[PDB]
Amino acid sequence: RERTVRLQYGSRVEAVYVLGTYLWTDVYSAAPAGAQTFSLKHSEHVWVEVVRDGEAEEVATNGKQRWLLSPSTTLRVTMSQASTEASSDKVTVNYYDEEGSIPIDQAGLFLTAIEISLDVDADRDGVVEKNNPKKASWTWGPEGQGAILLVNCDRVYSKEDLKDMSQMILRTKGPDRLPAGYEIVLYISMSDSDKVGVFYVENPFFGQRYIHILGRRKLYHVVKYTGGSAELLFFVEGLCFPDEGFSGLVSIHVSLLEYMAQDIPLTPIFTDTVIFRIAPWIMTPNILPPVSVFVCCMKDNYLFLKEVKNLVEKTNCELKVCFQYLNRGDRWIQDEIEFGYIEAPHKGFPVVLDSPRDGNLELLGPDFGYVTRESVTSLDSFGNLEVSPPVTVNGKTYPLGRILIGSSFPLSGGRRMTKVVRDFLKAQQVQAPVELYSDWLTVGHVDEFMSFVPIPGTKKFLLLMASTSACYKLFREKQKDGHGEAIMFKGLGGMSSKRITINKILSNESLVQENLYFQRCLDWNRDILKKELGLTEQDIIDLPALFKMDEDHRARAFFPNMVNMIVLDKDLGIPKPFGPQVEEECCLEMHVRGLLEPLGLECTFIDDISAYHKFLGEVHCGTNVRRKPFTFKWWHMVPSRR
Amino acid sequence: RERTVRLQYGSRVEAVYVLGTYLWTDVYSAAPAGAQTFSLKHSEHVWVEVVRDGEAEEVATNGKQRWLLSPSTTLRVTMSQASTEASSDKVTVNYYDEEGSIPIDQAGLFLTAIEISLDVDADRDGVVEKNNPKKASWTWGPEGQGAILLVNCDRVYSKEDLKDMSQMILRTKGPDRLPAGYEIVLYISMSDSDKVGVFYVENPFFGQRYIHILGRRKLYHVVKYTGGSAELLFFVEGLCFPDEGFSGLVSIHVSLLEYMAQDIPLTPIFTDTVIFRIAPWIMTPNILPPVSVFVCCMKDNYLFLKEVKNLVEKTNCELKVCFQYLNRGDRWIQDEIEFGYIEAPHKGFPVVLDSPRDGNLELLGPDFGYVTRESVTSLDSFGNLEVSPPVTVNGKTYPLGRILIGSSFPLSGGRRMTKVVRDFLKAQQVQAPVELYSDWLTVGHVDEFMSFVPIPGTKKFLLLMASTSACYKLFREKQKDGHGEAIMFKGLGGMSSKRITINKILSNESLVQENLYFQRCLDWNRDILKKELGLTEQDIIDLPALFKMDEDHRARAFFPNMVNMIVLDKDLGIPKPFGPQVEEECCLEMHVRGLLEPLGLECTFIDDISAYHKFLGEVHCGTNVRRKPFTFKWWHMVPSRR
Ligand SMILES: [Ca+2]
Ligand SMILES: [Ca+2]
Ligand SMILES: [Ca+2]
Ligand SMILES: [Ca+2]
């Protein structure tokens, strides 16, 4: 980078030279009137070229060479090493008139060269490299560069308290002191001041006590200069995730400022900039390895707890049991909590989004970052948020999968998840969200009709879809087989008086029509999923489901929805359906086993309803599985622009 | 695109088939219980494949082939031509039990195939092509595609009134009527409703009267279906330019909706989408061919008008003379008005931004689009907005040049152009704006210190920089030559009593110090310009300038700033400086001629100050030049992301 420094007519100029730049120097203006030629001398560590109308010739330290004074004849001044106390770095220009060979005047330039670099890990290996040429940009992809910041999700300090922030190092080299009238200042924009924070030890002689030097209300910080070869260590934190008005990119600047006079702004003679991108919140699909299983239920639902514990004992996962709270729904671990993660090259951890029904008054432990929402419909629940396995769709890869959100049709006037949450998910960009149609369901959650499972022993997966058509087919077969009187809800005492059998279901004409309609709703979703996930019919299994319609023409489960299941690799916790009993086995359980088991999936049916004696379409338990993050690094993705 | 359509157990299904899709059809659910196999028939224009667990075999119109009933054995149904009144398009499936070869039941599918495509000129040739496969995306560059919309800058209708909007055509083919329970609806999002408007003839039998069918408060419009091969013509307008919260992209959708029942939302069985990008506002640099020269001044400033007219008579440009108005500054044609343009593949025109001092109460004529701003400092003036010629900077090309905006230093607390205007310019993206430092000037306009000129007979250009050092050098030479008593401001009667000479200027110690400081300000700009425009010293010419400092330590012209000049190709209108007279010629005029003339630039000095009898640093005239747009199409640029 070329920088202008003029000799001053008659008077010596003193300047700081920053390594990585060079100077162009006008010698003509400082020339006395009537002067004709000029010569120059310079010190050992200053390189000087005379540049005549574009042609540059290197000049000796002490020559006698003379050049004609011209506005188009200038100097180029370069230094490759920082000054020390032993340095006298200078360039002296002598001027001559036409007559004599003795100088009639002289103009000098006294230089102090310093190295100044604001450094970050822009090559994303976890180590802060020296002056990465690309540190002022941020690019996506395997070949991409620029530094990554984590949001601080836990919320004078100590170095340990800052352990998980990003490092930024100001590296300098130079003599004992900056020349008079200079200072170094770290700063950020007003706009970025609510996106970041920066910590520094201001007075290291008195301890290491990190203080917050940049952030809300603090836009600049003067940093003390240390001579010799020195490094100042800063820790940097993101304050928020990308969102509707925020791309996720922030900038930090350091400038060498020159004091001009009182009341005059200081001049930024050198500025160095680093860019950070704040890491997005990422959701984990069912195909990722389970770590912990979280469940919530009432204390006395014993079968549920026993059966869930038994399932988990089949795996290497740990079980975490939570009960009900005053401010939360009965499903809250599923509906109010979503497990996701963030990752930076140096580190990462799990981050839970929390959206309490009644608001906060609780935690899954210290391992997790926690993010809590600052009217709402049931579509706002995280039961209405799913994420697919990695897919490729028409040649475009989605290595982190795609987020799925239930909605209504555009012209319907129906329910929709709040824009705030939709915009948040879209802004994360790496999961490229898709809206499905959940609004035909009373509760309105995508997890009521669909789920994903891995196919054991492969890298592949299946979409599982609720199907009313599959149920009616099955019930019609059993009836033809002479099982029409087979009763459902066996062992639920509060259903007994209804005496619901296969015959009674099949003869209900309005229920048939309602369920044909619900199948159309399911099929509309099937088509969007196949399109947006790149799936064919061989990727899909239908599980029997049945719904009753409410006054809004919306569906609620007739019997528990088996699609909403605990997926731990090969082992599946499946809600126990309480279907018609044939030869003393539930025909729904047997049908589902016949679909899944041949694929190597192991089915365990979990009874969450017996404790309540009946099923009205509501489930009083919830589960959520914490998973290992993707092996693919999010920063290696190349998302579409805008 | 694959779409799900199930046969209905026992009952015939009727469906609309949209060309460009195909159906997957479950035959298993409609099968009676206990049925074993199935066979099918179909009409001539329906293609049917039996797909067994992924293997597809095409089937004859009337065969006797039978297949085992299975959930994994389905049909794939395709049609390549739209139905007519002569069509009976159908597929019939017969079911058999184990015993006999006579069908025990049958399920049909009756189809009406229609073509539906919402078409735009996405290939950017000005003609609306049939169903461009890329019409749902918008990509930059020479190979890029997707349709372009112009903002309506002039603001029941007629086709002529819509002449300059973008065309969008809904093309359909099919029989006399849609089957019962279907309608076609054009729609946009609530968010886009203030970005666009769409016009349509609703009742063509009663005339061609275009009405506004989509836009503010109108999010959808039902369009009437016409049988046979038909086209509906829509005209589309943008309502606003890209800005801080708006990328410039909008979407328009058409859906075929199916009526389900009363109180049930209609089902979107087919949707087609087109994307538009609204064309950005683009500024014209001094190197583009002049068309018209606009000037403003007081009625009696005769020399100015005479000399400007004489200059323009040297060219093929036309002159437009405007006087002063109550609501505007004396420079308003320069300060309150900026000439720019917009372009779409079909058309383009000039578009003026207007920012009246006191607000609007005026027009350059009907050829122009007009855009007027909805506290402010002098940095908000368009005198503070410039644009460079096309440049390449470190390998990155800026084919439209880059916009330059004067500002203060980040930590200075100084003045800055309003964020609204800065955000607007940034959002246009194609001119990639750069902030300079103008705040050391009292008025604070970049046009006070810098300009661009083409180098005649080449594709190259020069940056012209005001230089105080150049002036002091020149004055010191003339003094040494014995011209120290040469007087400035000759012929300005109100300056005479000051008796300002070269000696008096050179002996003023504080003025010398002030101007050294201003030269530092100029040089700081020089360096930013060289960096951000990719310029070297051979691209720059310095013109002599001199300033006086005010109480804020800001500069105002001592003598008229010659850099702010009328550039018409080789011919330059240069403010007459009223410099010291040597041998009866202004030494400033002679110096500037000696710099410019050798390059083939022709200099004409224009006196805008004599009518006022003196110069206090303020100029009472303004000029602005309307230019031809760049030959390079903006949509061929590939801007950096974000
Ligand atoms: Ca690194
Ligand atoms: Ca969820
Ligand atoms: Ca076209
Ligand atoms: Ca301007």
Give the minimum alpha-carbon distance from A513 to chain B in angstroms, rounded to a whole number: 11
DSSP strand pairing (A37-42 vs A210-214)? unpaired
A297 is catalytic: no
- A476 Cβ contact list (under 8 Å, min separation 6): A506, B32, B33
Deposited experimental method:
X-ray
Q: Output the CA–CA distances (angstroms, integers) from residue A490 to A484, A486, A559, A614, A623, in the order listed.
A: 15, 10, 12, 10, 25
Q: Cα–Cα–Cα angle for A557, A563, A567, nearest 5°?
A: 145
- Classify B310 as helix, strand or coil: helix
- Classify B56 as helix, strand or coil: strand
Strand partners, A540: A463
List residues in chain B that are followed by a break over 2.5 Å (C to N).
Answer: 155, 361, 374
Strand intervals (E) in A55-138: 55-59, 67-68, 73-78, 89-96, 105-119
> If phi over 0 gives left and psi between -120 and 50 gives alpha, with beta otherwise, what is residue B426?
alpha
- Classify B214 as helix, strand or coil: strand
Closest CA to A558 of A506, A594, A604, A605: A506
Residues of B in contact with A517 (CB under 8 A): 260, 264
Strand intervals (E) in A281-372: 282-283, 290-296, 318-322, 337-343, 348-354, 369-372
**Binding site, annotated residues of B for Ca(2+):** 121, 123, 125, 127, 129, 152, 154, 161, 164, 338, 367, 382, 385-386
Q: Would you state the structure tokens that stand for residue B200, as one six-digit string?
A: 């349509």
CB-CB: which of A266, A526, A641 is closest to B4? A526
B411 and A8 in contact by Cβ < 8 A?
no
Burial of A640 (0-12, 13-18, 19+ CB in 10 A): exposed
Phi, psi dihedrals of residue A511, rounded to the nearest 5°: -65, -35
Round to whole Å and give the CA distance between B566 and B312: 10
Residue whose structure tokens are 């909403």: A564
Round to whole Å and give the CA distance between B109 and A260: 86
Rounded to 10 degrees, the C-alpha dihedral A491/A493/A499/A504 comes to -70
- B270 Cβ contact list (under 8 Å, min separation 6): B16, B18, B21, B116, B255, B256
- B180 Cβ contact list (under 8 Å, min separation 6): none
Give the minimum alpha-carbon distance from B538 to chain A in angstroms, rounded to a whole number: 7
Q: Would you state the structure tokens that stand for residue B150, as one six-digit string?
A: 């112009």
Residue whose structure tokens are 């297949």: B67
Strand partners, B201: B210
Q: Cα–Cα–Cα angle for A501, A507, A509, nearest 5°?
A: 130
Given a contact cutoff of 8 angstroms between Cβ atoms, the answer to whether A289 and A627 are in contact is: yes
Give the minimum alpha-carbon distance from B468 to chain A in angstroms, rounded to a whole number: 10
> If phi over 0 gives left and psi between -120 and 50 gives alpha, with beta otherwise, what is residue B202?
alpha
Size of interface A-B (CB pairs under 8 A): 144
Strand intervals (E) in B550-589: 555-557, 566-568, 571-575, 581-582, 585-586
Q: Cα–Cα–Cα angle for B482, B483, B488, nearest 5°?
A: 165
Q: Would you state the structure tokens that stand for residue A439, as one six-digit string?
A: 């609004």
Given a contact cutoff of 8 angstroms between Cβ atoms, the answer to whether B463 and B316 are in contact is: no
- Classify B484 as helix, strand or coil: coil
Q: Would you state the structure tokens that stand for residue B462, as one six-digit string?
A: 């020069």
- B591 Cβ contact list (under 8 Å, min separation 6): B470, B474, B544
Q: Which residues of A153-168 are buried (b: 16+ CB within 10 A; e: fewer)?
A: beeeeeeeebebbbbb
Phi, psi dihedrals of residue B306, rounded to the nearest 5°: -65, -45
Concatenating the DSSP letter of every residue in A433-463 gives -EEEE-TTBSS--HHHHEEEEE-TTSS-EEE
Residues of A in contact with B267 (CB under 8 A): 409, 520, 524
Residue whose structure tokens are 């130079």: A174
Which of B407, B478, B591, B642 is the best mutation test for A, with the most CBs of A within 10 A? B642
Given a contact cutoff of 8 angstroms between Cβ atoms, the answer to whether A133 and A76 are in contact is: no
Q: Would you state the structure tokens that stand for residue B278, as one six-digit string?
A: 């609204």
- CATH 2.60.40.1700 residue spans of chain B: 120-278
Q: Which residues of B396-407 are buried (b: 16+ CB within 10 A; e: fewer)?
A: eebbbbbbbbbb
CB-CB: which of B32, B187, B413 is closest to A410? B187
Output the CA B32–ligand 1 centroid distance in Å: 67
Round to whole Å and give the CA distance between B490 and B579: 8
Amino acid at A535: L
Strand partners, B321: B295
CB-side exposure of A122: number of CA atoms within 13 Å? 23
Q: Output the CA–CA distances (angstroms, integers) from residue A616 to A332, A548, A574, A609, B171, in the order listed.
A: 19, 10, 18, 10, 49
CB-CB: which of A268, A516, A531 is closest to B409? A268
Taking CA–CA distances from A262, the nearest residue in chain B reads: B553
- Sign of the C-alpha dihedral computed for residues A49, A50, A52 and A55 taken in this order: negative
DSSP strand pairing (A348-354 vs A369-372)? parallel
Round to whole Å and give the CA distance between A568 and A627: 9
B527 and A4 in contact by Cβ < 8 A?
yes
Output the CA B438–ligand 1 centroid distance in Å: 38
Round to whole Å and give the CA distance between A475 and A503: 9
Phi, psi dihedrals of residue A42, rounded to the nearest 5°: -155, 165
Given a contact cutoff of 8 angstroms between Cβ atoms, the answer to whether B273 and B311 are in contact is: no
- Sign of the C-alpha dihedral computed for residues B100, B103, B105 and B106 taken in this order: positive
Given a contact cutoff of 8 angstroms between Cβ atoms, the answer to whether B331 and B619 are in contact is: yes
Given a contact cutoff of 8 angstroms between Cβ atoms, the answer to whether A185 and A198 are in contact is: no
B524 and A263 in contact by Cβ < 8 A?
no
A386 is in an annotated binding site: yes
Which of B193, B222, B251, B473 is the best mutation test for A, with the most CBs of A within 10 A? B473
A382 is in an annotated binding site: yes
CATH superfamily of B279-642: L-arginine/glycine Amidinotransferase; Chain A (3.75.10.10)
Largest CA distance in chain A: 128
Q: Would you state the structure tokens that stand for residue B347, as one six-digit string?
A: 């058309």
B33 and A6 in contact by Cβ < 8 A?
no
Q: Percentage helix, strand, coil, to 5, in chain B?
A: 20, 35, 45
Round to whole Å and give the CA distance between A225 and A209: 18
The DSSP letter of residue B78 is E
CB-CB: which of B8, B408, B480 is closest to A34? B480
Round to whole Å and give the CA distance between B613 and B578: 12
Q: What kind of fold does domain A120-278 have according to CATH?
A: Immunoglobulin-like (2.60.40)
Residues of B in contact with A553 (CB under 8 A): 263-264
Amino acid at A71: P
Round to whole Å and give the CA distance between B354 and A530: 51
Describe the strand order of the beta sheet including B403-407 as a list of residue ranges. B385-387, B403-407, B434-437
Q: Cα–Cα–Cα angle for A150, A153, A157, nearest 5°?
A: 85
Q: Which residues of A383-395 are buried (b: 16+ CB within 10 A; e: fewer)?
A: bbbbbbbbbeeee
Residues of A in contact with B26 (CB under 8 A): 469
Closest CA to B463 of B442, B438, B446, B445: B446
Round to whole Å and give the CA distance between B121 and A633: 39
Measured from the Cβ of residue B255, the count of other Cβ atoms closer than 10 Å reads: 24
Round to whole Å and give the CA distance between A498 and A182: 88
Strand partners, A375: none
Given a contact cutoff of 8 angstroms between Cβ atoms, the answer to whether B340 and B351 are in contact is: yes
Overall size of chain A counted in residues: 642
Strand partners, B170: B118, B232
DSSP strand pairing (A13-18 vs A105-119)? parallel
Round to whole Å and give the CA distance between A604 and A611: 18
Measured from the Cβ of residue B392, the count of other Cβ atoms closer than 10 Å reads: 11
Round to whole Å and give the CA distance between A491 and A470: 25
Terminal-to-terminal C-alpha distance of chain A: 33
Given a contact cutoff of 8 angstroms between Cβ atoms, the answer to whether B76 and B25 are in contact is: yes
Residues of B in contact with A267 (CB under 8 A): 409, 520, 524
- Sign of the C-alpha dihedral computed for residues B523, B528, B529 and B534 taken in this order: positive
Round to whole Å and give the CA distance between A401 and B194: 33
Instruction: For helices B468-478 and B587-596, give the axis angle rounded to 10 degrees.
Output: 120
Output the CA A627–ligand 1 centroid distance in Å: 28
Phi, psi dihedrals of residue A311, rounded to the nearest 5°: -60, -50
Amino acid at A400: L
Q: Would you state the structure tokens that stand for residue B570, as one six-digit string?
A: 């080789």
Phi, psi dihedrals of residue A445, rounded to the nearest 5°: -110, 130
Residues of A in contact with B408 (CB under 8 A): 265
Closest CA to A8 of B515, B541, B475: B515
Q: Would you state the structure tokens that stand for residue A451, as one six-digit string?
A: 């789920």
- CATH 3.75.10.10 residue spans of chain A: 279-642
> If phi over 0 gives left and psi between -120 and 50 gives alpha, with beta otherwise, what is residue A446?
alpha
Round to whole Å and give the CA distance between A97 and B310: 44
Kindly name the residue from A297, A471, A587, A621 that is annotated as catalytic.
A621
CATH of A1-119 among 3.30.420.10, 3.40.30.10, 2.60.40.1860, 3.40.630.190: 2.60.40.1860
- A548 Cβ contact list (under 8 Å, min separation 6): A511, A514, A555, A556, A558, A617
CB-side exposure of B33: number of CA atoms within 13 Å? 17
Q: Would you state the structure tokens that stand for residue B515, as one six-digit string?
A: 């101007």
Closest CA to A360 of A372, A375, A378: A372
CB-CB: which of A3, A189, A553 is closest to B263? A553
Residues of B in contact with A464 (CB under 8 A): none
- A372 Cβ contact list (under 8 Å, min separation 6): A353, A354, A355, A356, A360
Strand partners, A114: A18
Taking CA–CA distances from B55, the nearest residue in chain A reads: A538
| Residue A250 host element (H or E) | strand A249-258
- Classify B391 as helix, strand or coil: strand
A411 and B220 in contact by Cβ < 8 A?
yes
Q: Would you state the structure tokens that stand for residue A456, as one six-digit string?
A: 């054991």
DSSP strand pairing (B37-42 vs B89-96)? antiparallel
Round to whole Å and give the CA distance between B21 and B270: 9
- Classify A541 as helix, strand or coil: strand
Strand partners, B591: none
**Binding site, annotated residues of B:** 121, 123, 125, 127, 129, 152, 154, 161, 164, 338, 367, 382, 385-386
Describe the strand order of the beta sheet including A348-354 as a list of residue ranges. A282-283, A337-343, A348-354, A369-372
Closest CA to A354 of A329, A375, A377: A329
List residues in chain A that are followed by a break over 2.5 Å (C to N).
Answer: 155, 361, 374
Q: Would you state the structure tokens that stand for residue A94, as one six-digit string?
A: 């002598």
Output the CA B264–ligand 2 centroid distance in Å: 27
* Chain mean position to CA B301: 38
- CATH 2.60.40.1860 residue spans of chain B: 1-119
